[PDB]
Tab-separated table of C-alpha atoms and ligand atoms in Angstrom:
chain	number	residue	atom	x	y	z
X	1	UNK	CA	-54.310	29.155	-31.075
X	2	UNK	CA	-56.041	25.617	-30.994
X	3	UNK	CA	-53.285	23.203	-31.554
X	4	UNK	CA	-53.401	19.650	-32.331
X	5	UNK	CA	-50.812	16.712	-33.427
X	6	UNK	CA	-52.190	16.082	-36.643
X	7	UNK	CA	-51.013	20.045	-37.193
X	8	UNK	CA	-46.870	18.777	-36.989
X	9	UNK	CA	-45.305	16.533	-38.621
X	10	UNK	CA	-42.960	14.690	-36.347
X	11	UNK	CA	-39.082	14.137	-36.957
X	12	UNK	CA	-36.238	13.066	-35.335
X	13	UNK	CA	-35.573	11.955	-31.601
X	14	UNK	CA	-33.460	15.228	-30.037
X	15	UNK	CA	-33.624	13.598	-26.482
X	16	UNK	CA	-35.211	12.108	-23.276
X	17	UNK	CA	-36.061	14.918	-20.565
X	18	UNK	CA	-38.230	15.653	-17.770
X	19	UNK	CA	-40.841	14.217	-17.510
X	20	UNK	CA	-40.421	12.724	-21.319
X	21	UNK	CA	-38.847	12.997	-24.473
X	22	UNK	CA	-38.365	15.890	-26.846
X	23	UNK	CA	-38.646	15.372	-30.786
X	24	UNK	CA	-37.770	17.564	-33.924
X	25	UNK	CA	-41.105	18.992	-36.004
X	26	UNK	CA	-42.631	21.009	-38.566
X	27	UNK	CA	-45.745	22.595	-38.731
X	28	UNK	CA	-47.722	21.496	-41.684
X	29	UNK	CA	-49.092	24.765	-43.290
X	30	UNK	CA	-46.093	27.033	-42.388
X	31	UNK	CA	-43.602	24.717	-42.188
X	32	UNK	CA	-42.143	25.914	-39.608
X	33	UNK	CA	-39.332	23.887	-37.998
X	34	UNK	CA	-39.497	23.657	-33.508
X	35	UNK	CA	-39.244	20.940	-31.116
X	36	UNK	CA	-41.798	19.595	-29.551
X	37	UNK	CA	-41.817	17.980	-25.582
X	38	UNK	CA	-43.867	15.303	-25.298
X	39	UNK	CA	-45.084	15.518	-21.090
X	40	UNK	CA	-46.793	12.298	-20.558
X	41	UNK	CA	-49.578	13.275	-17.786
X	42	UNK	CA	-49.518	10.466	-15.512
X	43	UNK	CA	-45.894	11.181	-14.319
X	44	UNK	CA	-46.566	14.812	-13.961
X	45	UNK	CA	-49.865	13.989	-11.608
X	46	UNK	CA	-47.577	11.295	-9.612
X	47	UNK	CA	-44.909	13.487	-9.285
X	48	UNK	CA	-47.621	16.756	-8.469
X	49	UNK	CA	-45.751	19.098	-10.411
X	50	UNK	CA	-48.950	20.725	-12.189
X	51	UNK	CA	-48.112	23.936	-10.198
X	52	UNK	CA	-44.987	24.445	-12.104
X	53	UNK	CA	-46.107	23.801	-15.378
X	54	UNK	CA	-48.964	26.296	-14.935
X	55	UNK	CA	-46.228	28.822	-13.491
X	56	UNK	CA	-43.810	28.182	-16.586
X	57	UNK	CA	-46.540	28.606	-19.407
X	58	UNK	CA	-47.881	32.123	-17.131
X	59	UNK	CA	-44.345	33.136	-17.363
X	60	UNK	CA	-43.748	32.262	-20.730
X	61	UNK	CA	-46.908	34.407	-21.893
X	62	UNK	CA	-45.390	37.556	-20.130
X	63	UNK	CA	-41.655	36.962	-20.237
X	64	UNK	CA	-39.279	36.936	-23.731
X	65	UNK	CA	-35.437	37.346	-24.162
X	66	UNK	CA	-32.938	36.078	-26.887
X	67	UNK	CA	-30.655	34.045	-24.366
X	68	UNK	CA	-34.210	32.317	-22.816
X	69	UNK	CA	-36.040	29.558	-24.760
X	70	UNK	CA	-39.533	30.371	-25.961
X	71	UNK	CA	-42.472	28.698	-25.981
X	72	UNK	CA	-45.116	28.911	-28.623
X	73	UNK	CA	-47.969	27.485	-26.930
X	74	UNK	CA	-49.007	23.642	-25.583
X	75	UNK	CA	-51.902	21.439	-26.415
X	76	UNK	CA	-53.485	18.088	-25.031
X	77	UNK	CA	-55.090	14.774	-25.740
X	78	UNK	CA	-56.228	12.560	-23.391
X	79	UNK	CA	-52.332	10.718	-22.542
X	80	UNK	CA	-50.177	13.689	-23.128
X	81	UNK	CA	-49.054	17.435	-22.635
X	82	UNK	CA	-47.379	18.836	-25.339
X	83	UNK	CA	-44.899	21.482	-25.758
X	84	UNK	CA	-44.265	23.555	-28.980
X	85	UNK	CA	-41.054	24.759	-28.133
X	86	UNK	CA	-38.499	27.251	-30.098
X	87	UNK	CA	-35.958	24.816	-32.135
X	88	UNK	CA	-32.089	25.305	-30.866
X	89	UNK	CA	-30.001	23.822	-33.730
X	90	UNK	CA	-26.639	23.812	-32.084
X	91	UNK	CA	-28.105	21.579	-29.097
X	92	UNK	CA	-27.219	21.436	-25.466
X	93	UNK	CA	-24.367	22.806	-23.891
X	94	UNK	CA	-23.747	19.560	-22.016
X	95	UNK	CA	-23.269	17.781	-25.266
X	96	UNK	CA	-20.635	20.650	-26.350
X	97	UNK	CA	-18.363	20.450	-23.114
X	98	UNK	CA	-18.858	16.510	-22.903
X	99	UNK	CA	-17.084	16.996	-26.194
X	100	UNK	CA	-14.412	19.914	-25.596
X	101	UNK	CA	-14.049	18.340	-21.773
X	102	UNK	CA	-13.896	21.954	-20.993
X	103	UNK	CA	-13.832	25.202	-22.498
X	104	UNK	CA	-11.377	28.689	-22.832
X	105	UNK	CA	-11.764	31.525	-21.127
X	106	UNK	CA	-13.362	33.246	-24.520
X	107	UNK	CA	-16.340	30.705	-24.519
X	108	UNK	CA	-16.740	30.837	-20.787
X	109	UNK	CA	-16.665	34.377	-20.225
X	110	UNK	CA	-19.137	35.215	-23.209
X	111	UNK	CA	-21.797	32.113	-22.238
X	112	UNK	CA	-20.811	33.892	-18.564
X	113	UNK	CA	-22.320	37.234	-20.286
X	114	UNK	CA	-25.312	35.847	-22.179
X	115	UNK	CA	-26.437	34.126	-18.897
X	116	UNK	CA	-25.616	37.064	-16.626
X	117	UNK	CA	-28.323	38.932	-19.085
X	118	UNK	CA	-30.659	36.483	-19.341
X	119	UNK	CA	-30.887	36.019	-15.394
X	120	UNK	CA	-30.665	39.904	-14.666
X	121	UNK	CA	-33.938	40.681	-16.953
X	122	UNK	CA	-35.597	37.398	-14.952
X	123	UNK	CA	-34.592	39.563	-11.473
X	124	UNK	CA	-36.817	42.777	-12.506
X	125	UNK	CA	-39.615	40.790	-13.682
X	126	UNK	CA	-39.418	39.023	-9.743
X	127	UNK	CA	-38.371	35.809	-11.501
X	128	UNK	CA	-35.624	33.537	-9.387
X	129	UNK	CA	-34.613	30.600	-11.404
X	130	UNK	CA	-32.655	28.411	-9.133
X	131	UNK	CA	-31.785	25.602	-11.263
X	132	UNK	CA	-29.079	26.810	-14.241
X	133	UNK	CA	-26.861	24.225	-14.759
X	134	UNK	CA	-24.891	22.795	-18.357
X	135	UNK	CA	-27.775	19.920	-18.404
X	136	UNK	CA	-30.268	23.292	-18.951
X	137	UNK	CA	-28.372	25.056	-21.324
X	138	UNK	CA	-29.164	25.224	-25.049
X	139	UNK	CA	-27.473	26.904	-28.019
X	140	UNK	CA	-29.266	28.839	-30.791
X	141	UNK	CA	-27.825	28.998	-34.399
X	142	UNK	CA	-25.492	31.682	-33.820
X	143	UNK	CA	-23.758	30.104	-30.562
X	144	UNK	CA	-25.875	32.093	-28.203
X	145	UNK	CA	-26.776	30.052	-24.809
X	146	UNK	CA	-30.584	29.523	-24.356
X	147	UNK	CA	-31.875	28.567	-20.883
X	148	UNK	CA	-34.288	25.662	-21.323
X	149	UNK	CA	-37.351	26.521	-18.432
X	150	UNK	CA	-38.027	29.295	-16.343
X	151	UNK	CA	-37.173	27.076	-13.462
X	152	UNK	CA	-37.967	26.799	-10.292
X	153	UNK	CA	-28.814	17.225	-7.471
X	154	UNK	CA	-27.141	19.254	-5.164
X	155	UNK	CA	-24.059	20.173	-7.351
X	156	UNK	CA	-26.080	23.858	-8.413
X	157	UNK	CA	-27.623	24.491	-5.281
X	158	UNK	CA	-26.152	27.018	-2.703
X	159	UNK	CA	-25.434	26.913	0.824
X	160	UNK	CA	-28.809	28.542	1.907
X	161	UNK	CA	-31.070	25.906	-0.301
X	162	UNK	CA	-29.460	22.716	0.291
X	163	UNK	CA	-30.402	23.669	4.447
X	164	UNK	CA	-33.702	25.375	3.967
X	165	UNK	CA	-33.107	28.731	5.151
X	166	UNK	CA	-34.262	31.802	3.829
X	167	UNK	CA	-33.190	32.447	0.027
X	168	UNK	CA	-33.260	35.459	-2.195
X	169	UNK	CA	-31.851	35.905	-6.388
X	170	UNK	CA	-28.773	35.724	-4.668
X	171	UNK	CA	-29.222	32.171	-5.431
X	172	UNK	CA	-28.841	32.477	-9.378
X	173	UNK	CA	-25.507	34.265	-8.533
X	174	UNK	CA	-24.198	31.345	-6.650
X	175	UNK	CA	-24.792	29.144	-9.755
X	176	UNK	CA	-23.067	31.109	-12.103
X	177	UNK	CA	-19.842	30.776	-10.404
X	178	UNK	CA	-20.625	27.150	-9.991
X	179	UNK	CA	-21.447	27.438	-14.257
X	180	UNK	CA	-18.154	29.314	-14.249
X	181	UNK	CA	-15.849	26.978	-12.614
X	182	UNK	CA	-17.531	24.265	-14.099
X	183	UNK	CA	-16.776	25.575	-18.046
X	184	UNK	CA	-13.418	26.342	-17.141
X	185	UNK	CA	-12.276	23.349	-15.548
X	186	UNK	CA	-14.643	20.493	-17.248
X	187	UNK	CA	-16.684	19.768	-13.562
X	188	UNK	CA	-18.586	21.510	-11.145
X	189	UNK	CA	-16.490	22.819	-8.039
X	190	UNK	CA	-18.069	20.559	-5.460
X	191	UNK	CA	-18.358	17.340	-7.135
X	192	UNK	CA	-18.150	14.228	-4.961
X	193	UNK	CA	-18.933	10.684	-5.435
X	194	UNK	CA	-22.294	10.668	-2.408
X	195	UNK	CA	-24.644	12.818	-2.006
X	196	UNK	CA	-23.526	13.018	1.419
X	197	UNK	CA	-20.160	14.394	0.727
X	198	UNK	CA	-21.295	17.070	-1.667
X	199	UNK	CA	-23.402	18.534	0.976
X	200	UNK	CA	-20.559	18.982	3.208
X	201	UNK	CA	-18.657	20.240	0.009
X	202	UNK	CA	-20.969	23.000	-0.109
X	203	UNK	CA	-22.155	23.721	3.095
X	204	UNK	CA	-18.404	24.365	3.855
X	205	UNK	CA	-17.577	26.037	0.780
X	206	UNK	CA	-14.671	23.356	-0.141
X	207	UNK	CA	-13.181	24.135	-3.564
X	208	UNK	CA	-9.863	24.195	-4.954
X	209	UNK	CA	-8.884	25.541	-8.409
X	210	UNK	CA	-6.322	23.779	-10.818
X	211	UNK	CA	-3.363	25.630	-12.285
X	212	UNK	CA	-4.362	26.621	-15.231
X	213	UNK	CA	-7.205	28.608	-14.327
X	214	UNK	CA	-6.141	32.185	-14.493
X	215	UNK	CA	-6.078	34.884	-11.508
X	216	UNK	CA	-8.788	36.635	-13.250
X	217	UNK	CA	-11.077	33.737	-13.353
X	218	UNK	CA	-10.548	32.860	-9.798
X	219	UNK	CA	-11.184	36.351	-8.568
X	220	UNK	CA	-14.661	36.346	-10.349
X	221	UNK	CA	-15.854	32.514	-9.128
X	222	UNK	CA	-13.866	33.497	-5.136
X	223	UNK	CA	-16.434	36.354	-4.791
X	224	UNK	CA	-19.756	33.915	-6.544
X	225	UNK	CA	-19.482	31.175	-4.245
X	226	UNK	CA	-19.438	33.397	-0.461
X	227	UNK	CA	-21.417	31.456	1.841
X	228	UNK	CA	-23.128	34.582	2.935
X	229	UNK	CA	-25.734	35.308	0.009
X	230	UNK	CA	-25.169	39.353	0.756
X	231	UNK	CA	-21.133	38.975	-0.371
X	232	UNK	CA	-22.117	37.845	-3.303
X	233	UNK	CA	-21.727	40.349	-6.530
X	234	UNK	CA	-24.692	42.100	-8.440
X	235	UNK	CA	-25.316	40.789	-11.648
X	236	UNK	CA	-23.977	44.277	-12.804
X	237	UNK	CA	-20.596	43.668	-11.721
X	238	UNK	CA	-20.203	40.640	-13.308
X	239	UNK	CA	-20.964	41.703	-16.484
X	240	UNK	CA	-18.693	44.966	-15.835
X	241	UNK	CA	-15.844	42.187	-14.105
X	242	UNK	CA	-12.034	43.169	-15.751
X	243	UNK	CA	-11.560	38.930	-16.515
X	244	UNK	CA	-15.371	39.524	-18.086
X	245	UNK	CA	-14.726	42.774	-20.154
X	246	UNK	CA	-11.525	41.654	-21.870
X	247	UNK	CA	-12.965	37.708	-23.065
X	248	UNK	CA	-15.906	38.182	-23.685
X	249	UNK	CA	-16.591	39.301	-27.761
X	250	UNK	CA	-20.476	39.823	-26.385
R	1	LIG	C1	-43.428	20.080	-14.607
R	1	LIG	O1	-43.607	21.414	-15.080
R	1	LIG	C2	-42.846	21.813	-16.143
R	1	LIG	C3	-42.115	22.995	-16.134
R	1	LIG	C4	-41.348	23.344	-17.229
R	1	LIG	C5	-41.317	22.521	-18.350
R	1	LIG	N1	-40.533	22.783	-19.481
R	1	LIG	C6	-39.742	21.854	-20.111
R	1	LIG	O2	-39.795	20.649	-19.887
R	1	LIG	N2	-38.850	22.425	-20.982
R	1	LIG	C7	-37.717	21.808	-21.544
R	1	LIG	C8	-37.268	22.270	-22.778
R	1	LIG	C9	-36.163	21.714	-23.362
R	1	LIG	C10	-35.474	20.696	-22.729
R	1	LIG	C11	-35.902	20.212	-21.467
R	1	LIG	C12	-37.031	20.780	-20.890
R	1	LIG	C13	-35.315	19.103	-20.641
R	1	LIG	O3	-36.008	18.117	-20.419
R	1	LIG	N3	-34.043	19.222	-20.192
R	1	LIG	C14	-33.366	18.178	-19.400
R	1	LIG	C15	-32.054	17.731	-20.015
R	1	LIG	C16	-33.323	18.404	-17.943
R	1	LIG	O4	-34.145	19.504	-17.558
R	1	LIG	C17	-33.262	20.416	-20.564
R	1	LIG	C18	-32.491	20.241	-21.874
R	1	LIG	C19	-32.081	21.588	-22.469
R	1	LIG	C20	-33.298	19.395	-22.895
R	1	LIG	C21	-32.488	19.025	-24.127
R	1	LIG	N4	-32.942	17.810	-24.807
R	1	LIG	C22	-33.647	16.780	-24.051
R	1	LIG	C23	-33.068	17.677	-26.261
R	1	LIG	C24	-33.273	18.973	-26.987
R	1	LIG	C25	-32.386	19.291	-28.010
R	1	LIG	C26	-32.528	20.444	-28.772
R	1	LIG	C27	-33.597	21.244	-28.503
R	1	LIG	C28	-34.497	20.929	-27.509
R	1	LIG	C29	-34.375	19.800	-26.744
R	1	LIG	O5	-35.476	21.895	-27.438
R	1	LIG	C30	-35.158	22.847	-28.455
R	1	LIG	O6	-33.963	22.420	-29.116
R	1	LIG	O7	-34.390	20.212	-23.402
R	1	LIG	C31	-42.032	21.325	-18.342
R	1	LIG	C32	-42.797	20.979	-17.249
């Protein structure tokens, strides 16, 4: 599948990212339309982050689901890595709730669903993805939520990560009530303005809900964010949650 630049024509600027910048193309001969992620290689050797790159391409060959983004393949020159990317024409879910401030309990508890799915497929194929959060998150043409990587800013992380101890897929769970709260309510439920603070935040569990989030909505993010990774729900019963079942249309 020997790529090369001259194969794409390049269009418009969808954003800077890791590592560098992502851009709108189409393949010459098919025309087919994708993004493609320009990696510059000198940040990725002084950062030393080859490791994961080779881990998200091995993943990438094996692993495929409609809520995850796909990649096509990658090619090089000398300066840069590039990634040929599945196109997501409805863009990020940051931009959306930047927008909206925050969203209803319809939009939540579907994206809530379509995550839920995407990260309990990732658990039997031994895949933990520990870093879901709205800046991740895109949208295909139908609405549907598409996680950017495969994985792998403490605001996401849970109380067993952000002090080193021992951490299972349990993880994931913990960030989908952080997700949860954070659609509902238009920020994440441990923001703070240091670093500092937010550690406390979370170490301690410290959140507090506003009024208008419902009892339903509380019950499911209350039983996410348990310090103890163990109280924390299967994916299974989220999906099969009574606040779940009855907003969700997926
Ligand atoms: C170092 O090893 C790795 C490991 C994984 C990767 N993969 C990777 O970089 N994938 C990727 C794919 C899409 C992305 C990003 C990252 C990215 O850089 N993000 C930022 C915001 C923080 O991680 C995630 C966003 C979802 C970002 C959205 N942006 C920049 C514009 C955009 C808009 C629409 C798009 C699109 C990209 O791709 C398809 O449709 O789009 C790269 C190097």
């Amino acid at each position: 599948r020997q790529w090369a630049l001259e194969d794409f024509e390049i269009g418009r600027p969808l954003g800077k990212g890791k590592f560098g910048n992502v851009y709108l193309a189409r393949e010459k001969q098919s025309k087919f339309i994708l993004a493609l992620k320009v990696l510059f290689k000198a940040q990725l050797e002084k950062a030393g982050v080859e490791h994961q790159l080779r881990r998200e391409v091995e993943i990438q060959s094996h692993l495929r689901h409609p809520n995850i983004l796909r990649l096509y393949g990658y090619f090089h020159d000398a300066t840069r890595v590039y990634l040929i990317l599945e196109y997501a024409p409805l863009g990020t879910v940051y931009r959306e709730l930047q927008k909206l401030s925050k969203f209803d309990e319809q939009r939540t508890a579907t994206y809530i669903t379509e995550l839920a799915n995407a990260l309990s497929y990732c658990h039997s194929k031994r895949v933990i993805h520990r870093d879901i959060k709205p800046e991740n998150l895109l949208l295909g043409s139908a609405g549907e939520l598409k996680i950017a990587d495969f994985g792998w800013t403490l605001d996401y992380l849970p109380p067993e990560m952000i002090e080193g101890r021992m951490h299972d897929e349990k993880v994931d769970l913990w960030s989908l009530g952080v997700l949860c709260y954070e659609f509902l309510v238009g920020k994440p439920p441990f923001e703070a303005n240091t670093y500092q603070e937010t550690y406390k935040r979370i170490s301690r569990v410290e959140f507090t809900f506003p009024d208008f989030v419902t009892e339903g909505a509380r019950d499911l993010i209350s039983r996410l964010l348990k310090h103890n990774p163990s109280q924390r729900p299967m994916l299974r019963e989220v999906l099969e949650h009574p606040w779940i079942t009855a907003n969700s249309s997926k």
